[PDB]
Amino acid sequence: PRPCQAPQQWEGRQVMYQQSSGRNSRALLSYDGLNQRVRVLDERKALIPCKRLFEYILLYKDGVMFQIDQATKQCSKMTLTQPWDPLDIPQNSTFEDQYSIGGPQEQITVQEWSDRKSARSYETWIGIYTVKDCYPVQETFTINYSVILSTRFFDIQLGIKDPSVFTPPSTCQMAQLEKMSEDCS
Amino acid sequence: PRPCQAPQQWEGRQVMYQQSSGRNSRALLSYDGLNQRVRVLDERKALIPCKRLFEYILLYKDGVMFQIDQATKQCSKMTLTQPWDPLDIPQNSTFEDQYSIGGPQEQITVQEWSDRKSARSYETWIGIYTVKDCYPVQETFTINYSVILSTRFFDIQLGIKDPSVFTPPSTCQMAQLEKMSED
């Protein structure tokens, strides 16, 4: 099996697990592969634990990220140290397995890909994409075999419906220069 | 939305994350909800790192787990602290959400349920099950909102092809009382 080409612009929702917190966080996502930008709007279901809701606009072209309190519109601007890393399967990945989620009438077939050298082979980005359309399902990053971060994607709809979602608000002009906490006060 | 009725007998494969270790492990699974028995055969994926493969047979109606070394069939026999908890949606669970996995023209709709409640929004179990079929997709157990374990399921086939998979090997007749590590 060769790697499919993932769509480069879409919007839906995600659930991100982070080792650093032990927790799952939900958000709306806007992924612009064409423009090497991303926007993440934190979503809440349960009111507890108590946390502040943020909006993130990442603009790898301009080497900057903005983080915006969804309520009060406060804005802190920060550097982009990390290099652009798209949601597609890199051409040299290793095919790991293929499986079916669900059952007859409904099911979906996905493939799992990693970066892993047969001669002492282990996997450090692990991507799950659907077979027919190449939609991203899941992305996991591993250090020394242990999960650091894993994101599930869903409710994917193609394209960016309104690119203004990547336009920071006025409040970012005089933006602060360090990350605002999520902790309830 | 009310809770769908998940099939009580099937076999497939799974991938289980554990917060304790931070790692995922693979296995085949045979789930027999009717007879309260589960069989787990650890699947190897790759060396790196090096760990030994067991098979687990869980016979809840007899209060015991067997752990079997796949390379040697050495058996240890372990009392189950566990009480039986089936892979279904408890009638009284809370509806959390419905969403689509995949994308247009290659999509599957699922529902997320928990034992969380409206007034003091707090969980221990969170299942993901398909809307149409009620197949299991994913289970997470959390404490104080933190992930303890999370299992993803796939290649589900209804029924049990060979119920002798639930029958311990004869070596479990002279079982050890104590457990085997992997290294």
Residue numbers in the entry:
A (entry chain A): 39 to 223
B (entry chain B): 39 to 221
From the reporting publication:
Orthologous proteins to ependymin called ependymin-related proteins (EPDRs) have been found to exist in various tissues from sea urchins to humans, yet their functional role remains to be revealed. All six of the cysteine residues in the monomeric subunit participate in the formation of three intramolecular disulfide bonds.
The structure of human EPDR1 was subjected to a fold-similarity search using the DALI server, and the top two highest scoring structures were found to be the bacterial VioE (r.m.s.d. = 3.7 Å; Z-score = 14.6) and the bacterial LolA (r.m.s.d. = 4.0 Å; Z-score = 12.3). Also, in a recent structure of human EPDR1 that preceded our study, a ligand was observed in this cavity and was also modeled as an extended PEG chain from the crystallization condition. Because the displacement of 1,8-ANS by fatty acids is often used to assess the binding of fatty acids to fatty-acid-binding proteins, a similar approach was made using human EPDR1 and the fatty acids caproic acid (C6), lauric acid (C12) and stearic acid (C18). The displacement assays suggested that smaller fatty acids more preferably interact with human EPDR1.
